[PDB]
Design a protein around this motif. Sequence first.
Motif, PDB file in Angstrom:
ATOM      1  N   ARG A 128      -6.238  -3.306   1.778  1.00 60.70           N
ATOM      2  CA  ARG A 128      -5.679  -2.909   0.412  1.00 60.70           C
ATOM      3  C   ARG A 128      -5.842  -3.791  -0.276  1.00 60.70           C
ATOM      4  NH1 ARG A 128      -1.532   1.178  -0.953  1.00 60.70           N
ATOM      5  NH2 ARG A 128      -2.140   0.607  -3.115  1.00 60.70           N
ATOM      6  N   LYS A 129      -6.036  -3.964  -2.086  1.00 60.61           N
ATOM      7  CA  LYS A 129      -5.510  -5.172  -2.680  1.00 60.61           C
ATOM      8  C   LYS A 129      -3.506  -4.984  -3.076  1.00 60.61           C
ATOM      9  CE  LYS A 129      -9.760  -7.960  -2.960  1.00 60.61           C
ATOM     10  NZ  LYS A 129     -10.244  -7.456  -1.526  1.00 60.61           N
ATOM     11  N   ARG A 130      -3.284  -5.057  -2.671  1.00 59.05           N
ATOM     12  CA  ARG A 130      -1.560  -6.177  -3.616  1.00 59.05           C
ATOM     13  C   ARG A 130      -2.374  -5.813  -4.878  1.00 59.05           C
ATOM     14  NH1 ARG A 130      -3.301 -11.042  -3.276  1.00 59.05           N
ATOM     15  NH2 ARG A 130      -5.277 -10.655  -3.709  1.00 59.05           N
ATOM     16  N   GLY A 131      -1.053  -6.428  -5.414  1.00 61.89           N
ATOM     17  CA  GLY A 131      -1.167  -6.398  -7.239  1.00 61.89           C
ATOM     18  C   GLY A 131      -1.202  -5.008  -7.423  1.00 61.89           C
ATOM     19  N   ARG A 132      -2.602  -5.097  -7.678  1.00 57.69           N
ATOM     20  CA  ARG A 132      -3.037  -3.181  -8.475  1.00 57.69           C
ATOM     21  C   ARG A 132      -2.022  -2.134  -7.660  1.00 57.69           C
ATOM     22  NH1 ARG A 132      -8.030  -4.949  -7.398  1.00 57.69           N
ATOM     23  NH2 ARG A 132      -9.560  -5.953  -9.491  1.00 57.69           N
ATOM     24  N   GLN A 133      -1.402  -1.618  -8.184  1.00 57.47           N
ATOM     25  CA  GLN A 133      -0.561  -0.860  -7.937  1.00 57.47           C
ATOM     26  C   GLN A 133      -1.398   0.298  -6.776  1.00 57.47           C
ATOM     27  OE1 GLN A 133       1.609   1.647 -11.810  1.00 57.47           O
ATOM     28  NE2 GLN A 133       1.598  -0.960 -12.097  1.00 57.47           N
ATOM     29  N   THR A 134      -2.171   0.919  -7.897  1.00 60.94           N
ATOM     30  CA  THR A 134      -2.738   2.938  -7.325  1.00 60.94           C
ATOM     31  C   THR A 134      -1.870   3.527  -6.428  1.00 60.94           C
ATOM     32  OG1 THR A 134      -4.959   3.180  -7.531  1.00 60.94           O
ATOM     33  CG2 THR A 134      -4.394   1.018  -5.713  1.00 60.94           C
ATOM     34  N   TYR A 135      -0.244   3.475  -7.126  1.00 61.27           N
ATOM     35  CA  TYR A 135       0.468   4.430  -6.229  1.00 61.27           C
ATOM     36  C   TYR A 135       0.039   5.306  -6.808  1.00 61.27           C
ATOM     37  CZ  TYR A 135       2.024  -0.359  -4.593  1.00 61.27           C
ATOM     38  OH  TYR A 135       2.525  -1.328  -4.100  1.00 61.27           O
ATOM     39  N   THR A 136       1.043   6.920  -6.108  1.00 58.55           N
ATOM     40  CA  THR A 136       0.771   8.518  -6.683  1.00 58.55           C
ATOM     41  C   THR A 136       1.926   8.847  -7.698  1.00 58.55           C
ATOM     42  OG1 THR A 136       1.319   9.677  -4.667  1.00 58.55           O
ATOM     43  CG2 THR A 136      -0.988   9.233  -4.925  1.00 58.55           C
ATOM     44  N   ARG A 137       2.076   9.238  -8.356  1.00 57.25           N
ATOM     45  CA  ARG A 137       3.084   9.378  -8.867  1.00 57.25           C
ATOM     46  C   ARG A 137       4.617   9.952  -7.858  1.00 57.25           C
ATOM     47  NH1 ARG A 137       7.045   8.365 -12.735  1.00 57.25           N
ATOM     48  NH2 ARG A 137       7.844   8.620 -10.385  1.00 57.25           N
ATOM     49  N   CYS A 165       3.639   5.892   4.080  1.00 59.69           N
ATOM     50  CA  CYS A 165       2.695   5.439   4.774  1.00 59.69           C
ATOM     51  C   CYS A 165       2.188   4.236   3.557  1.00 59.69           C
ATOM     52  CB  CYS A 165       1.310   6.112   4.409  1.00 59.69           C
ATOM     53  SG  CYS A 165      -0.079   6.750   3.287  1.00 59.69           S
ATOM     54  N   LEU A 166       3.660   3.352   3.245  1.00 57.25           N
ATOM     55  CA  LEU A 166       3.455   1.996   2.466  1.00 57.25           C
ATOM     56  C   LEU A 166       3.813   1.178   3.734  1.00 57.25           C
ATOM     57  CD1 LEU A 166       2.805   3.586  -0.268  1.00 57.25           C
ATOM     58  CD2 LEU A 166       4.651   1.935  -1.613  1.00 57.25           C
ATOM     59  N   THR A 167       3.537   0.411   3.527  1.00 63.60           N
ATOM     60  CA  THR A 167       4.050  -1.463   3.920  1.00 63.60           C
ATOM     61  C   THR A 167       5.562  -2.096   3.695  1.00 63.60           C
ATOM     62  OG1 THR A 167       2.457  -2.422   3.452  1.00 63.60           O
ATOM     63  CG2 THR A 167       2.098  -1.672   5.784  1.00 63.60           C
ATOM     64  N   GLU A 168       6.368  -2.651   4.895  1.00 66.68           N
ATOM     65  CA  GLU A 168       8.111  -3.198   3.870  1.00 66.68           C
ATOM     66  C   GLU A 168       7.509  -4.286   2.475  1.00 66.68           C
ATOM     67  OE1 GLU A 168       5.479  -4.002   6.167  1.00 66.68           O
ATOM     68  OE2 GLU A 168       6.211  -4.114   7.419  1.00 66.68           O
ATOM     69  N   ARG A 169       6.374  -5.108   2.820  1.00 65.31           N
ATOM     70  CA  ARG A 169       6.094  -6.169   1.933  1.00 65.31           C
ATOM     71  C   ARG A 169       5.817  -5.660   0.809  1.00 65.31           C
ATOM     72  NH1 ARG A 169       1.619  -9.135   1.469  1.00 65.31           N
ATOM     73  NH2 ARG A 169       1.911 -11.065  -0.657  1.00 65.31           N
TER      74      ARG A 169
END
Length: 68
Positions: free
Chosen positions: A2-11, A40-44
């Motif tokens: 994953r690249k961080r910073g760029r959210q790209t999360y589902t609604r 399926c995210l990370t604590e960070r």
Amino acid sequence: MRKRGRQTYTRYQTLELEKEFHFNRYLTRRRRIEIAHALCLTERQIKIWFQNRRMKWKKENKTKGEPG
């Protein structure tokens, strides 16, 4: 990867963070393990999203701007 910073999360993903934050505006070790698994995210990145979600609450919520 994953690249961080760029959210790209589902609604939805952000919705479950939003239902989770609404119930509990601080996360525990345990609850983060559950949360990380759940979306399926990370604590960070949860720390980042939660940190964002509480900025503009725990730094604005009431707070008379100018002391007087």
